[PDB]
From a paper:
The presence of IFRD1 does not affect the paralog enrichment events because the testis specific paralog enrichment was identical between the testis 80S and testis polysome ribosomes, and polysomes are unlikely to be translational repressed. To verify this, we solved the structure of ribosomes isolated from testis polysomes (cryo-EM average resolution was 4.9 Å). It is clear from the density map that IFRD1 is not present in either the P- or E-sites; rather there is density for the E-tRNA in these actively translating ribosomes. In summary, we have solved the structures of testis 80S, ovary 80S and testis polysomal ribosomes, which exhibit differences in translational activity.
Numbering used by the authors:
A (entry chain CL): 55 to 159
B (entry chain CN): 2 to 204
C (entry chain Cz): 1 to 217
D (entry chain CG): 80 to 271
E (entry chain Ci): 58 to 113
RNA sequence: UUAUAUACAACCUCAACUCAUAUGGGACUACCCCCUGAAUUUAAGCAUAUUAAUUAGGGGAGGAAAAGAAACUAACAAGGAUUUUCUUAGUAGCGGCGAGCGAAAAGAAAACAGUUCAGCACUAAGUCACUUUGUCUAUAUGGCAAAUGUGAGAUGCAGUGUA
RNA sequence: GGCGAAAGCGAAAAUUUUCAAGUAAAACAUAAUUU
RNA sequence: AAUAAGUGGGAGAUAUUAGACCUCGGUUUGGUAUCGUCAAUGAAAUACCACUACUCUUAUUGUUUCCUUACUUACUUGAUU
């Protein structure tokens, strides 16, 4: 849920919680579309985000994730996943915490 | 491909070619009745463009409707009550003929669903369309799963419930602000949605 | 009833100007006479068809002009071989003749001094509207730079009250590669003097002094 | 009066040369199905172990299907096009001979829409455009393509220009011819 | 296919026959003053291809 | 093969069958769906307004129905499928500018899921369904081949490709 | 056959491939026949 | 020179001829020329050469609430087994 900046002069402040995700951002941020879809991104193929820093705004928010994303292996030879498999959630996280913060304004 | 040519020649109606190929075709098309099965769709390529293949068996049924207005059934000197409600001899129906011409298949034919439609021709005493029926339980059609969508139970008889080509378009459906009611579900299920008062648990 | 050396109906593109040099079927000089089939260009108003085009090649118009000079016409005019007179030929240009084999209206275009203007309709005026070679004030008449351009092919056309046109611009005896830059610049110098032009005429007409009129697009 | 894109049907090249046209087509049936089966089952047992790429020699025959053909016309690989004329509706075949003058390729029309589908093991076929340029049928190739030139392709520049068509017919024409036969029996004595 | 007869009836009209009303004969016909101006000049594209290729 | 003088083979429209083999009108209705559209009442009377795009309205569905992946917004430091609720708001306009009607993107909340058709070039019908005979079993209108037995299929089947 | 949004039609449904009952029958729609 | 459509270009064209050259006409040179650019002098400077177009004129494929007449296959109206 990445999206920022609500429309008119009522809001130059707030930022609605993320229904867009900008396909043309993604190739500039190391993805990898349908691999990210079964990760779970809400990848949606229809938003054409117009601003370079709004392009950048999710770019850091992308790289905010994808690192703490723990990479569970598929073939369990785990040669190419490739962040970690020793950070398995029983060892590392297993958190299942709700809130998913949107930077809190 | 020939089809992109033959659509490009289908449009150019008001010719001597198509009109005087309509002219032979039109009053060929009348000593036959209101219903008769055919093998082959007269337009093939606009029986194509419509979600259509030609396996066994996607039947085609000719149909005519009576090309007019609609007069309001009260006898001989018209309605009581109010002068908002007098005028008859010009009153006009709502559902277009291209969604009446699939009710007049779906009940005379007790066996089959309805898929799309396409016009052919028009002259003054009928407009007269085609119906691309679909069989429902030919034991081929269960294992043909690109057109599997229509033989769930909730899609049968899609002439009444208004989800053919024209019967979709008849009830005022799209988005946004040329359509803003109808939005509350169907059409005038708007005009039971918005008058629905919410006397709360805790006001 | 059209001719071969002068085409009328058939409209060529850009490569159809190469054979127009063949209009010199004579051996003597023929002055090309322009004309235009004009539409809604009425001459009795301020739309006066009177100006000068500047053809960058010299098609040698036979130019003789009496240079009326009062300390401003002939001071810098020794670079173009002026006659160097003191504006005294006006006293003999009308009411009498000069010499044998000569008329009293013997030019094509005339120049006047800036301080010698009120005489031009009075003593010479009634004897020149009978000729129609009347010099105007908008026909490149200042004689500060109008000396080197005098041998550099200056013309003056007066509009007729019968809707015709025949004035000398040049000849057709030379190469059509000269005429590739002659017509395509003179008619581009004709768009600026004519008015409200986007598409108001359908073709041009070009005619020599001894030939039939050719027509260009 | 049918408009003079018709009659592009059915002035159709008298059958003494047309039977020679089918004699090329006797070699160019697409595939017999057991011969199709015996070719592909040899892939299964022999060429699955043979590892050979040469001996297929995919034989050039005449292609079928309208949606095949109008690629093959436009990609300039086709040689001779045969389209039927007993046809429906026209729009699969109406514009198609008009392509051939603008695309330069010689074409022809045939009588009998079933005879193109008699040999190809379908039911009715309507579109057979030929690509084959082999030396075994190169001899009889040149003479029949010269015949369809003036009849179909060089005729194609003046076929729309001359057609009124649709004669009146026929008993009424007898009454039409009755008066002129009557008045010519009277015209023998007016000026006499 | 030939012509659709309003184009042909105006094909006579765009010869010399009063282009302005002929143009408004299309906007009366088709007709919206954005759509007609394309269908106006389409006729002249036929007419500018058949001024000297129209011989034989 | 048609002076309307015969066969055979297709085709094309097109029948008839105590053929084979199978699908459908009906019941209910609260909710839902496309339909047809009235009236007392209110204006202190009434005729356009209102009752109302409303009760019979009946033809259709289901555990969902319709909608739904924009020919939308908004005009901004942008947003972004459909549906219901809070608010937008009893405000904008429609109004015998009478009585009275009446929305809306935008703001926040649940849930979230995106994609096949048609049509260039996609480039050996490589397709699909019956049949019979067995494989394999199962209360299957069933899974594997085959005779390649039909027929459907080029008037186009399939794969890849889609606002 | 027809029309109606459907239910159904204050209806001499006389138009509706054969819309023939058929007839112990004959090739080669059994023969003139039955609205 | 009248009678220059008119009005302006023009300040001589054109034709002829032999000579020059070419296979040759012809162009050019000069002689001559009905007039004329010139003069004859006025309203247009008439030679030379015109775009335009009507008084209109011969002819062409004209849409025409065009009129009238036949045609028939669309369609309407019956008849018969």
């Amino acid at each position: 849920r990445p999206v920022v900046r609500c429309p008119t002069i009522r809001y130059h402040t707030k930022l609605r919680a993320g229904r867009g995700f900008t396909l043309e951002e993604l190739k500039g941020a190391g993805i990898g579309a349908n691999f990210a879809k079964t990760i779970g991104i809400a990848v949606d193929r229809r938003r054409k985000n117009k601003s370079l820093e709004s392009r950048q705004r999710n770019i850091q928010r992308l790289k905010e994730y994808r690192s703490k994303l723990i990479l569970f292996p598929i073939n369990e030879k785990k040669i190419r996943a490739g962040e970690s498999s020793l950070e398995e959630c029983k060892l590392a996280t297993q958190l299942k915490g709700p809130v998913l913060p949107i930077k809190n304004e | 491909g020939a089809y992109r040519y033959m659509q490009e020649l289908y449009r150019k109606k008001q010719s001597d070619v198509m009109r005087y190929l309509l002219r032979i075709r039109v009053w060929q098309y009348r000593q036959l009745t209101k219903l008769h099965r055919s093998p082959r769709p007269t337009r093939p390529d606009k029986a194509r463009r419509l979600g259509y293949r030609a396996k066994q068996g996607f039947v085609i049924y000719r149909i005519r409707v009576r090309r007019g207005g609609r007069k309001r059934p009260v006898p001989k000197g018209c309605t009581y009550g109010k002068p908002k409600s007098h005028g008859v001899n010009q009153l006009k129906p709502y559902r277009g003929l291209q969604s009446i011409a699939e009710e007049r298949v779906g009940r005379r034919l007790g066996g089959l669903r309805v898929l799309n439609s396409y016009w052919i021709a028009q002259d003054a005493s009928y407009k007269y369309f085609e119906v691309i029926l679909i069989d429902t339980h030919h034991s081929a059609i269960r294992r043909d799963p690109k057109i599997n969508w229509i033989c769930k139970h909730v899609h049968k008889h899609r002439e009444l419930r208004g989800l053919t080509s024209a019967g979709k378009s008849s009830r005022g459906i799209g988005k946004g602000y040329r359509y803003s009611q109808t939005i509350g579900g169907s059409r005038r299920a708007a005009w039971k949605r918005k008058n629905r008062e919410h006397m709360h648990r805790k006001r | 009833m059209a001719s071969k050396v002068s085409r009328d109906t058939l409209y060529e593109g850009v490569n159809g100007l190469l054979e127009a040099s063949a209009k010199k079927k004579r051996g003597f000089l023929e002055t090309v006479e322009l004309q235009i089939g004009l539409k809604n260009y009425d001459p009795q108003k301020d739309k006066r068809f009177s100006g000068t085009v500047k053809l960058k090649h010299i098609p040698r118009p036979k130019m003789k002009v009496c240079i009326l000079g009062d300390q401003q016409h002939c001071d810098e005019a020794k670079a173009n071989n002026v006659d160097f007179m003191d504006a005294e030929a006006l006293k003999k240009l009308n009411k009498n003749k000069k010499l044998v084999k000569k008329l009293a209206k013997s030019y094509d275009a005339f120049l006047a001094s800036e301080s010698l203007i009120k005489q031009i309709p009075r003593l010479l005026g009634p004897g020149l509207n009978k000729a129609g070679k009347f010099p105007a004030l908008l026909s490149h008449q200042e004689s500060m730079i109008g000396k080197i351009e005098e041998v550099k092919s200056t013309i003056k056309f007066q509009m007729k009250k019968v809707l015709c046109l025949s004035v000398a611009v040049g000849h057709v005896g030379m190469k059509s590669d000269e005429l590739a830059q002659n017509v395509n610049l003179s008619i581009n110098f004709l768009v600026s003097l004519l008015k409200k032009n986007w598409q108001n005429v359908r073709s041009l007409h070009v005619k020599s002094s001894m030939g039939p009129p050719q027509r260009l697009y | 009066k049918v408009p003079p894109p018709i009659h592009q049907f059915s002035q159709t090249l008298d059958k003494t040369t047309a039977v020679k046209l089918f004699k090329l087509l006797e070699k160019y049936r697409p595939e017999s199905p057991l011969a199709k089966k015996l070719r592909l089952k040899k892939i299964a047992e022999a060429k699955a172990k043979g590892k050979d790429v040469e001996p297929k020699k995919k034989p050039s025959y005449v292609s079928a299907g309208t949606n095949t053909v109008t690629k093959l016309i436009e990609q300039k690989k086709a040689q001779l096009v045969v389209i039927a004329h007993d046809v429906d509706p026209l729009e699969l075949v109406l514009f198609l001979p008009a392509l051939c003058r603008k695309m330069g390729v010689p074409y022809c029309i045939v009588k009998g829409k079933a005879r193109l589908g008699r040999l190809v093991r379908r039911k009715t076929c309507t579109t057979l455009a030929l690509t084959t340029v082999d030396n075994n049928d190169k001899a009889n190739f040149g003479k029949v393509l010269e015949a369809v030139k003036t009849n179909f392709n060089e005729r194609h520049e003046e076929i729309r220009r001359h057609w009124g068509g649709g004669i009146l017919g026929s008993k009424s024409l007898a009454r039409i011819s009755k008066l002129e036969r009557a008045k010519a029996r009277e015209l023998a004595q007016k000026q006499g | 296919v030939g012509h659709a007869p309003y184009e042909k009836r105006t094909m006579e009209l765009l010869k010399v026959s009063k282009d302005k009303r002929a143009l408004k004969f299309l906007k009366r016909r088709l007709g919206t003053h954005i759509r007609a101006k394309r269908k106006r000049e389409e006729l002249s594209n036929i007419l500018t291809q058949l001024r000297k290729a129209q011989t034989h």
